[PDB]
């Protein structure tokens, strides 16, 4: 439904307004039951995650509990590890920039709460290098915490020993990928690996590893504190909890606000954030989960609600839940065209289908914006699109195909007219 | 992506970490597991850039030696990521975000403003080498859509004029109040908090027993 209470919200420091440093955090009481929780043991913590129903919170929303659980298997003499991706690259995502900058601590105890759940020896946080200032904030926060003894040996009074580190990203969206974050951490080129050697099995430095969206790590301590039920109650069925929503582009007050997941879309922009610029009638389309997810046209928006189950019914992905809105004042053919330009300037090129395919769609898309290309080419891009969708080594090729598929699926008449417009003036 | 040796950009340019920098390099290596120094390539290479913006081929070679990694590896990392200059770069090095979110909120205007403000075209740098204009991609901070990254700072939610003001500040004086030069605080609802209006909660609240 929606309408989460501020009291039941998780990052009270969102929008700042409270010292992102420890003191403000102590008034927040973020480090309240940390020793106790870890004392409970890895299993109990992971269990709470399952009860929570917390899905990914990052890109694909895999059940968090089960995922983390995959490394709750006995150590084989290799130190297990925690990797917390804070790349936050998906266009439209400033979701994570908040927790890191505004509430660094929540993530610090998220790390150790999560750490004992997987029995990780240590956690490395890969904040995108672009955010240099952001990094300045977290290690100040990490430094505070150890000074306190909250982390490190004798973590918060626990025999558990966990060390948290921050790693510099270098302006790559793909670094974000789970197998590629690792390789950047490993120091090689940021190129994803194949899934058959799964991340838990082969870890960073060949030591079991797990990767979580920073939001996913951050909520785990509060969910254990509030209990899985409290959390699981807010969401709809499988889709559960309240996910932060970042609305950017063609909305009166673009902002990131956390609301009950499964909140109706027409409402999200209506209640928080602000009205669609030019009236709700001025809504050509919206991309619910960021650039990777397909945009949905207005007909669906009034009805569709932001939860992953509802969106997959709608053929779109909740993803990072970044709402980008396009008024009737925008050349979508060019809007999506720059996202394909966003992906040609960024895919690693390791795999044949993404390398040439994304460049191929970029060339066709640029011609489509001009209208130089004939109408028959439009359904070809479709066929080029699905060749890329199922054949890619990672998901980015998955992601490049979806916006192209959305433009053809709902805005096929407009592209034909741009086709027609150029043919007429000759 | 080919380094054709040039008198300026080639190893004749000797590179070596200042004593202090080497100390920093050591810590960086400590974070990673022992026996995995190679993992510190990115961090160390960055430090080199901090030392010299150009990050010449010589620098890349030094990084390799310092981390005992094959020279090619350093090259791969440098030529793969984008935050590494691999050429001389402007003192200010402004970067304008032009992904759809920003563009939808009129990013193009900002770029145009800069082009003539700077007098230099994108992909190029000012004669004094004070400013280098680059059309970079999503830099995060999308909510404050109109946004650009001057050097390390993130100037956000900027209207065309604001930048001119900022650029002037950069041109005469320094530290031009880096951040969103708008009424909004960070990424709050511009008009008024849609939530988080009430005071934050307290320790232990609604906590399940133990």
């Amino acid at each position: 439904f929606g309408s989460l209470k501020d009291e039941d919200r998780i990052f009270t420091n969102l929008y700042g307004r409270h010292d992102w440093r420890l003191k403000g955090a102590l008034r927040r009481g973020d480090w309240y039951k940390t020793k106790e929780i870890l004392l409970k043991g890895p299993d109990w913590i992971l269990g709470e995650m399952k009860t929570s129903g917390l899905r990914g919170r990052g890109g694909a929303g895999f059940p968090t509990g089960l995922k983390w659980s995959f490394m709750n298997k006995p150590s084989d003499g290799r130190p297990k590890y925690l990797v917390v991706n804070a790349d936050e690259g998906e266009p439209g995502t400033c979701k994570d920039r908040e927790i890191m900058r505004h509430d660094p601590h929540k993530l610090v105890e998220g790390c150790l709460v999560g750490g004992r759940a997987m029995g990780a020896r240590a956690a490395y946080i890969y904040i995108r290098g672009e955010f240099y200032n952001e990094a300045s904030n977290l290690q100040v926060a990490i430094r505070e915490a150890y000074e306190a003894g909250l982390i490190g040996k004798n973590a918060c009074g626990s025999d558990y020993d966990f060390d948290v580190f921050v790693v510099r990203g270098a302006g790559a969206y793909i670094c974000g990928e789970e197998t590629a974050l690792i390789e950047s951490i490993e120091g090689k080129q940021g190129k994803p690996r194949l899934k058959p050697p799964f991340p838990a099995d082969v870890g960073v430095f060949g030591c079991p590893t797990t990767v979580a969206n920073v939001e996913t790590v951050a909520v785990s301590p509060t969910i254990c504190r509030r209990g899985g039920t409290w959390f699981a109650g807010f969401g709809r069925e499988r889709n559960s909890g309240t996910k932060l929503f970042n609305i950017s582009g063609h909305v009166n007050h673009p902002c990131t606000v956390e609301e009950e997941m499964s909140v109706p879309l027409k409402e999200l922009i209506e209640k928080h954030a602000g009205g669609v610029t030019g009236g709700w009638d001025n809504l050509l389309a919206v991309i619910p989960g960021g650039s990777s997810t397909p945009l949905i046209p207005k007909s669906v928006c009034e009805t569709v609600l932001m939860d992953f189950d509802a969106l997959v019914q709608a053929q779109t992905g909740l993803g990072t839940a970044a709402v980008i809105v396009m008024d009737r004042s925008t050349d979508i053919v060019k809007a999506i065209a720059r996202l394909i330009e966003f992906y040609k300037h960024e895919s690693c090129g390791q795999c044949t289908p993404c390398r040439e395919g994304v460049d191929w769609m970029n060339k066709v898309m640029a011609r489509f914006v001009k209208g130089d290309a004939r109408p028959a080419e439009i359904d070809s891009l479709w066929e080029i699109s699905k060749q890329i969708e199922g054949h890619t080594i990672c998901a980015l090729g998955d992601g490049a195909a979806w916006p192209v598929q959305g433009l053809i699926r709902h805005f096929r008449p407009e592209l034909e007219d741009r086709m027609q417009r150029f043919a007429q003036q000759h | 992506f080919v380094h054709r040796d040039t008198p300026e950009n080639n190893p004749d340019t000797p590179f070596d970490f200042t004593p202090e920098n080497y100390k920093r390099i050591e810590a960086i290596v400590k974070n990673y597991p022992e026996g995995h120094q190679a993992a510190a390539v990115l961090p160390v290479l960055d430090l080199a850039q901090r030392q010299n913006g150009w990050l010449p081929i010589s620098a890349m070679n030094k990084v390799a030696e310092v981390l005992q990694v094959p020279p090619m590896r350093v090259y791969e990392v440098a030529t793969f990521y984008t935050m590494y200059n691999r050429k001389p770069v402007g003192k200010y090095h402004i970067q304008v975000c032009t992904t759809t979110p920003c563009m939808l909120r009129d990013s193009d205007s900002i770029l145009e403003t800069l082009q003539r403000k700077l007098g230099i075209k994108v992909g190029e740098t000012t004669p004094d080498k004070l400013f280098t204009l680059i059309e970079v991609e999503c830099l995060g901070a999308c909510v404050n859509a109109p946004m650009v990254q001057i050097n390390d700072n993130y100037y956000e939610d900027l209207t065309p004029k604001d930048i001119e003001e900022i650029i002037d500040e950069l041109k005469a004086g320094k530290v031009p109040k880096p951040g969103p030069r708008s009424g909004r605080f960070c990424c709050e609802p511009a008009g008024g908090l849609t939530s988080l209006t009430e005071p934050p909660k307290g320790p232990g609240f609604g906590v399940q027993a133990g």
Partner: peptide, 22 residues
């Protein structure tokens, strides 16, 4: 306001806290 070495130098300061290596 932060310096170019804030991240690295701060980290070095944290080195002492950093738990022993693997």
């Amino acid at each position: 306001d932060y310096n170019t070495y804030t991240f690295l130098d701060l980290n070095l300061d944290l080195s002492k806290f950093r738990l022993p290596q693997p």
